[PDB]
Symmetry: C3
Subunit: 253 residues, 3 copies
Amino acid sequence: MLEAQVQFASLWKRLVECINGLVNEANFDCNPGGLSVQAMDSSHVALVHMLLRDDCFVKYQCGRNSILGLNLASLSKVLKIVDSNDSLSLRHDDDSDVVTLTSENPEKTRKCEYQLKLLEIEAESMGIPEMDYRSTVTLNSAEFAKIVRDMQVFGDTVTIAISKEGVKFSSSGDVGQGYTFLQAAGVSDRGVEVTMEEPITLSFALRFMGIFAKGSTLSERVTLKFAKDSPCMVEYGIDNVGYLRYYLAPKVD
Amino acid sequence: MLEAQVQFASLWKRLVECINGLVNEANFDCNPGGLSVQAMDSSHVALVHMLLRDDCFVKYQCGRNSILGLNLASLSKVLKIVDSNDSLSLRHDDDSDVVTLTSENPEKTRKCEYQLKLLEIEAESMGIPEMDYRSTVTLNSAEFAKIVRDMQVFGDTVTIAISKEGVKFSSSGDVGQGYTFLQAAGVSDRGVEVTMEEPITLSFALRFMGIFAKGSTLSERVTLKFAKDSPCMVEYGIDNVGYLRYYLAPKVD
Amino acid sequence: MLEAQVQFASLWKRLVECINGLVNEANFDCNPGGLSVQAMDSSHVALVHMLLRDDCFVKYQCGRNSILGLNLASLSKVLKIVDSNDSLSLRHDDDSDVVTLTSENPEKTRKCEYQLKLLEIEAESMGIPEMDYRSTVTLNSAEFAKIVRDMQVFGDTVTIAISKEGVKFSSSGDVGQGYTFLQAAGVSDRGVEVTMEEPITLSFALRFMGIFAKGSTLSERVTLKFAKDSPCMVEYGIDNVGYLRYYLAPKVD
């Protein structure tokens, strides 16, 4: 008999969005740890890990370690109609086969309740190739989102070069050739924060880069980790309550 | 002969929207009382009745009861171009076969004039239902619009359950099952008012409540009236110079 | 060598949009007097002339008069991505065959470089039509723009009529008939400025007037010159650094 009440429904909304863009169904591992979603796309090139630490909710209950699959496509539909600044309780009951969403006014005068059938989804299998180590770059999430969305006019293959205090995005297509340089501002105190062990230059699929970048709604900064010849990682982190990561394979030559 | 000129054309633009949702030609009864439209949708389930009273216009001249058939499609198209803050004169001459919309700039520097051919429309049939209403809820027009656009994600029939302190809007369907609930106590003399004759519960095509709920461009509040086994009424008041009133058959067996 | 950096990219962005809606490829003559584009629509009925005087750029080098033909589709695409308020520099090296675009932050913090392949476009026939007569009218660009879009709900041919008093745009079609009238009697002494010799009433292909009107993003005002049985002209002066000028064939039975 799980329960998970976040305070501003806007979060769930911005999440399911990001994630729906990559898989249309997925399992919600509910542990008293918190909620997590792990999943791959249909072409098995990209990974989603999302954590919501139990201390992220304003209520919580997971004595059990239950799993709930559901339709993201449908959750996305129900979530679009849910006011941004309403509260939102996820809920289950033993073998119910139905999860139930519950929105309430701040002023406690509007109450909505939505109920989705669940699935019925198979074991995750592949997950968590780790750990990149070699180079880290951090930057403006929405800056980043733009840069991908931008490169896409050229090819659907971005190339990321990590230089001494440099991160360079190139692409090629029929149109021609673009790039974008970002020098590293550093380092304190109260811009781009490269931190390489290496000049390393991998490249990636833009379709998928794009899917990821939708994350910029959850976090102002975004972190990119690389390892020559390994699944790279893009991490959007909630400040005190969890993270969203994507891993994606390089192109090989 | 008929001249009828409103100050700000926004009002016309907004109204033809409301009603072009239900029917695409209507007869306008023009009489010295003012303009009135009364129309029924092709399936005979929903009736519109709109009245702009004579004083809604900055000036109004209607010797005799003439009837003009107008293609709401075309009208709507022409109103889309007329500016919100311009004035609009609707005029028709003795045996003119056409009606003419003239619009002027507040500063009289610009003058637009549009002529619409006018149709002959088979007489709009069944008459206004009434009257005794067990119940009467009155909530925010814009809220109500959201509620019916919301319910539409589920299925296309909305059940409206009326309680004291409550009115429940429920759906069902392939995506699942929602309900939005609005409560009604306090506070005189300072939400959602309700009225005690009985607990009553009817349901209705969402297709049509949708068409209705565009009424929220005309009035901050909408009023719902209901009676057992009878056509509900949704009335939006136009600034105390007319009303837009809709009626829909329950989806009873 | 050639090198032409404008201060705010906005200009090129709004510019390519204008001409891109007339031809999808065209020639960029760059002489030391400035940049010029002459272009004819495929249907050989209408004409773009566009100049930007050398004083218009923050840096401008053009010792000899080289031509660059290039794809307006691609160019439009690249400039959608470029920030309005970034600098943007245009370069071509001896016979390079590729032009390079270079955007930069005001604060030199992000740098972008795009490269496009150029082409050979064949010279488009007839120079520009010379003789102009005493019909003129100058209005708000944006009001002009609205009027075409407006007149287009009726037909596909606007009829422009210059009188001492004002200019009359009219149009007919399925929907009905419509006109817009504007006047210019006096300013006396602090929008419309007619200055004709004789009354003159031509008509025109709305499709193109639409295309032309996009110019309104360039200049707050717009001048239309006419001449009995001749191609009219629409001029959008850039603010003393250039002009965008369109020529269209009248339509006579």
